[PDB]
Design a protein around this motif. Sequence first.
Motif, PDB file in Angstrom:
ATOM      1  N   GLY A 192       0.778  -1.218   0.000  1.00 45.47           N
ATOM      2  CA  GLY A 192       0.000   0.000   0.000  1.00 45.47           C
ATOM      3  C   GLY A 192       0.815   1.276   0.000  1.00 45.47           C
TER       4      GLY A 192
ATOM      5  N   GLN B  73       7.729   2.929  -6.381  1.00 51.75           N
ATOM      6  CA  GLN B  73       6.779   4.002  -6.615  1.00 51.75           C
ATOM      7  C   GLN B  73       5.747   4.044  -5.500  1.00 51.75           C
ATOM      8  OE1 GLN B  73       5.247   4.209 -10.561  1.00 51.75           O
ATOM      9  NE2 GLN B  73       7.022   3.211 -11.509  1.00 51.75           N
TER      10      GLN B  73
ATOM     11  N   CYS C 214       1.965   6.518  -4.655  1.00 57.73           N
ATOM     12  CA  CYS C 214       1.074   7.560  -5.146  1.00 57.73           C
ATOM     13  C   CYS C 214      -0.275   7.512  -4.432  1.00 57.73           C
ATOM     14  CB  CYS C 214       0.907   7.416  -6.662  1.00 57.73           C
ATOM     15  SG  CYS C 214       0.043   8.769  -7.485  1.00 57.73           S
ATOM     16  N   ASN C 215      -0.273   7.733  -3.119  1.00 52.54           N
ATOM     17  CA  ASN C 215      -1.506   7.767  -2.328  1.00 52.54           C
ATOM     18  C   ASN C 215      -2.010   9.197  -2.147  1.00 52.54           C
ATOM     19  OD1 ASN C 215      -1.174   5.004  -2.140  1.00 52.54           O
ATOM     20  ND2 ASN C 215      -0.402   5.053  -0.033  1.00 52.54           N
TER      21      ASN C 215
ATOM     22  N   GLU D 246      -5.694   9.344  -0.308  1.00 57.05           N
ATOM     23  CA  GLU D 246      -5.776   8.963   1.092  1.00 57.05           C
ATOM     24  C   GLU D 246      -4.992   9.942   1.967  1.00 57.05           C
ATOM     25  OE1 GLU D 246      -4.470   4.779   1.114  1.00 57.05           O
ATOM     26  OE2 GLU D 246      -4.816   4.894  -1.051  1.00 57.05           O
TER      27      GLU D 246
ATOM     28  N   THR E 208      11.059  10.609 -10.940  1.00 57.88           N
ATOM     29  CA  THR E 208      10.084  11.462 -11.599  1.00 57.88           C
ATOM     30  C   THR E 208       8.809  11.424 -10.774  1.00 57.88           C
ATOM     31  OG1 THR E 208       9.013  12.004 -13.703  1.00 57.88           O
ATOM     32  CG2 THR E 208       9.113   9.682 -13.078  1.00 57.88           C
ATOM     33  N   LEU E 209       8.025  12.493 -10.880  1.00 57.39           N
ATOM     34  CA  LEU E 209       6.814  12.615 -10.085  1.00 57.39           C
ATOM     35  C   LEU E 209       5.793  13.454 -10.845  1.00 57.39           C
ATOM     36  CD1 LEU E 209       6.827  15.719  -8.669  1.00 57.39           C
ATOM     37  CD2 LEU E 209       8.596  14.635  -7.276  1.00 57.39           C
ATOM     38  N   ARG E 210       4.618  13.605 -10.242  1.00 59.18           N
ATOM     39  CA  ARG E 210       3.514  14.368 -10.808  1.00 59.18           C
ATOM     40  C   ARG E 210       3.245  15.582  -9.932  1.00 59.18           C
ATOM     41  NH1 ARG E 210       0.302  11.993 -15.138  1.00 59.18           N
ATOM     42  NH2 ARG E 210      -1.063  13.760 -14.638  1.00 59.18           N
TER      43      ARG E 210
ATOM     44  N   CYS F 140       3.271  11.574  -5.362  1.00 57.57           N
ATOM     45  CA  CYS F 140       3.140  10.601  -6.445  1.00 57.57           C
ATOM     46  C   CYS F 140       4.509  10.498  -7.113  1.00 57.57           C
ATOM     47  CB  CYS F 140       2.045  11.026  -7.437  1.00 57.57           C
ATOM     48  SG  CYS F 140       1.476   9.734  -8.559  1.00 57.57           S
ATOM     49  N   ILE F 141       5.350   9.586  -6.620  1.00 54.26           N
ATOM     50  CA  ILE F 141       6.766   9.548  -6.962  1.00 54.26           C
ATOM     51  C   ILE F 141       7.124   8.186  -7.542  1.00 54.26           C
ATOM     52  CG2 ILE F 141       9.057  10.261  -6.150  1.00 54.26           C
ATOM     53  CD1 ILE F 141       7.710  11.180  -3.584  1.00 54.26           C
ATOM     54  N   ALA F 142       8.145   8.176  -8.401  1.00 45.87           N
ATOM     55  CA  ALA F 142       8.701   6.948  -8.963  1.00 45.87           C
ATOM     56  C   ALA F 142      10.219   7.016  -8.857  1.00 45.87           C
ATOM     57  CB  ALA F 142       8.257   6.752 -10.413  1.00 45.87           C
TER      58      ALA F 142
ATOM     59  N   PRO G 248      -2.079   2.837  -5.568  1.00 44.59           N
ATOM     60  CA  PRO G 248      -1.462   3.905  -6.364  1.00 44.59           C
ATOM     61  C   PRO G 248      -2.435   4.570  -7.335  1.00 44.59           C
ATOM     62  CG  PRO G 248      -0.805   1.757  -7.190  1.00 44.59           C
ATOM     63  CD  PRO G 248      -1.543   1.507  -5.909  1.00 44.59           C
ATOM     64  N   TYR G 249      -2.645   5.869  -7.158  1.00 42.11           N
ATOM     65  CA  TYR G 249      -3.534   6.631  -8.024  1.00 42.11           C
ATOM     66  C   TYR G 249      -3.013   6.620  -9.459  1.00 42.11           C
ATOM     67  CZ  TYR G 249      -6.482  10.502  -9.651  1.00 42.11           C
ATOM     68  OH  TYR G 249      -7.377  11.287 -10.340  1.00 42.11           O
ATOM     69  N   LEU G 250      -1.700   6.780  -9.603  1.00 41.35           N
ATOM     70  CA  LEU G 250      -1.043   6.702 -10.903  1.00 41.35           C
ATOM     71  C   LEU G 250       0.215   5.845 -10.818  1.00 41.35           C
TER      72      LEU G 250
ATOM     73  N   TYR H 282       3.908   5.120 -13.008  1.00 40.04           N
ATOM     74  CA  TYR H 282       4.782   5.591 -14.073  1.00 40.04           C
ATOM     75  C   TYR H 282       5.439   4.403 -14.763  1.00 40.04           C
ATOM     76  CZ  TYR H 282       8.969   7.423 -16.328  1.00 40.04           C
ATOM     77  OH  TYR H 282       9.974   7.701 -17.221  1.00 40.04           O
TER      78      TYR H 282
ATOM     79  N   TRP I   7       2.400   7.903 -17.406  1.00 42.10           N
ATOM     80  CA  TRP I   7       1.608   7.592 -16.228  1.00 42.10           C
ATOM     81  C   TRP I   7       0.265   7.013 -16.649  1.00 42.10           C
ATOM     82  CZ3 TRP I   7       3.742   8.287 -11.365  1.00 42.10           C
ATOM     83  CH2 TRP I   7       4.897   9.075 -11.303  1.00 42.10           C
TER      84      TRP I   7
END
Lengths: 173, 11
Positions: free
Chosen positions: A28, A43, A45-46, A49, A76-78, A160-162, B2-4, B6, B9
Amino acid sequence: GSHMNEVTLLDSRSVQGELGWIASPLEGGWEEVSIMTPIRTYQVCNVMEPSQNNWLRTDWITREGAQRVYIEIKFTLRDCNSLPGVMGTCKETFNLYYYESDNDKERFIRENQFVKIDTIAADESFTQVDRIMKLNTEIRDVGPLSKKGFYLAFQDVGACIALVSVRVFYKKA
Amino acid sequence: XPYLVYREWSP
Ligand SMILES: [Cl-]
């Protein structure tokens, strides 16, 4: 900037550099995502929540004889703008930690034993590798080190990271 | 959850 004057302590992209990473929570939070020449990324990306505090740490890394090591992170991220309808607490950064230890099998390192290196953000510098991925590159250094080795950790608090790759090295005398 | 993700995305 070559291997002739830098000794690699950890390369997440290498054969034995992928095994050993521990995610807290185990599921999670940070999760492995292979991306391909396959690359093991982590990665999280919660952004929907609330109250996120996800951690990811390496296995024990020896510093060999280094008094100072260098940590290069490609990621990279959003932006939160790129994600309409997220919580008002959406973050665009993450935190980099380290904990020195003479022991190679620590099984109970807490948040308070980890010392923050810096807040990592998607900034001005980046790199570019059928397609091409454009990834932010950031490098940080820590020292003076004293223990036989150290652990590295990464904290997510609602972004929201990778994490595509992590490289640890030091510079020859 | 995870919402998105990569890979680009995707959900
Ligand atoms: Cl990784």
